[PDB]
Write a protein that binds this ligand. Structure first.
Ligand SMILES: CC(C)NC(=O)N[C@H]1CC[C@H](Nc2ncc3ccc(=O)n(C4CCCC4)c3n2)CC1
Length: 340
């Protein structure tokens, strides 16, 4: 009779359509819990994400609403695709949970970073990240929080980005969970305003970490993080700092100065495959792209288009809503998106 059934998966209770069999947990971010499952109707494996009471506050609601709207209308091979969406609840009054069904991938980028990776696979992963970012920028979406945990890959080295980043507004939370700030651009760190190549910084951080196998710019807060940035890349020029609001100008200009490191010193020959002439050249090219992505001043940083054109990468070449609402308003907005 009923077209749903329920099973326990850790703390949570997954109540899912009967087509979805043999649920297995595979991770848990901020918005919810995620299971792998077999889709008996499609004869394929899927990932199912549970959003619990997403309308419970502004922060969750805006994120859920945005993700649902964007995942449905954005169509690209390097952006995770929405296969199905449902709630087991029958009315707006009873409505609680939303379940998103997506293609099932094999790993996080975190896991891939830890591996020794050849240039063929590093450049291919980067290419795909850039193509995806490009797509988002063309659709009016500047991500600003690209990070390895929200990028997934398959064994065949296919790459998809999982989320659409920050809201243009931006907040307060209760759930004890730490946000990963390590990949954010200087302009996000310092609060400057940004353009599309804000996301290049993040790709630079990811690329660099693939080579060094350590997070480039860690720290408890933006204070420590900014210190790690300037210790490595050196203090930026005056031209840059003229672009900063008065109070953040004063902070940045009064921190201990550093000359920084050359990119050969930041990413030495040691870290690269460089045994054949092929690899010698690809290493050279790799460090050159890195040097162009990890630059503090966005005015001097490489664009997405110039990056896709770069020799390391080009071998692979081939409505609006952002407003405030109460709980009950959000709950209905999300419910009707779910019952399209
Ligand atoms: C032990 C070893 C075999 N694997 C492991 O440790 N982690 C894998 C296990 C399989 C995971 N696949 C996958 N596919 C689609 C999605 C879609 C949305 C989403 O939010 N996620 C989360 C990101 C990572 C956590 C879940 C998705 N995850 C990747 C991570």
């Amino acid at each position: 009779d009923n077209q749903f059934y329920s099973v326990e998966v850790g703390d949570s209770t997954f109540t899912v359509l009967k087509r979805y069999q043999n649920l297995k947990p595979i991770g848990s971010g901020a918005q919810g819990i995620v299971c792998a499952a077999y889709d008996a109707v499609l004869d394929r494996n899927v990932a199912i994400k549970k959003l619990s009471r997403p309308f419970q506050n502004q922060t969750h609601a805006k994120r859920a609403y945005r993700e649902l709207v964007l995942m449905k209308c954005v169509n690209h091979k390097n952006i995770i695709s929405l296969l199905n969406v449902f709630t087991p609840q029958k009315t707006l009054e009873e409505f609680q949970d939303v379940y998103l069904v997506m293609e099932l991938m094999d790993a996080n980028l975190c896991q891939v970073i830890q591996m020794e990776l050849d240039h063929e696979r590093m450049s291919y992963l980067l290419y795909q990240m850039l193509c995806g970012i490009k797509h988002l920028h063309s659709a009016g979406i500047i991500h600003r929080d690209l990070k390895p945990s929200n990028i997934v890959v398959k064994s065949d080295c296919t790459l998809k980005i999982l989320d659409f980043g920050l809201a243009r507004t931006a907040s307060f939370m209760m759930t004890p969970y730490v946000v990963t700030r390590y990949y954010r651009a200087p302009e996000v760190i310092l609060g400057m305003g940004y353009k599309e190549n804000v996301d290049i910084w993040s790709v630079g951080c990811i690329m660099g970490e693939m080579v060094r196998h350590k997070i480039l710019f860690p720290g408890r807060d933006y204070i420590d993080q900014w210190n790690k940035v300037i210790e490595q890349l050196g203090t930026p020029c005056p031209e840059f700092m003229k672009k900063l609001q008065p109070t953040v100008r004063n902070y940045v200009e009064n921190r201990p100065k550093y000359a920084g490191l050359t990119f050969p010193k930041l990413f030495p020959d040691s870290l690269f495959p460089a045994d054949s002439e092929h690899n010698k050249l690809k290493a050279s090219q790799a460090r050159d792209l890195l040097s162009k992505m990890l630059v503090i001043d966005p005015a001097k940083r490489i664009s997405v288009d110039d990056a896709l054109q770069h020799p390391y990468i080009n071998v692979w070449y081939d409505q609006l809503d952002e407003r405030e609402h109460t709980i009950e308003e959000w709950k209905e907005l999300i419910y009707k998106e779910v019952m399209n």
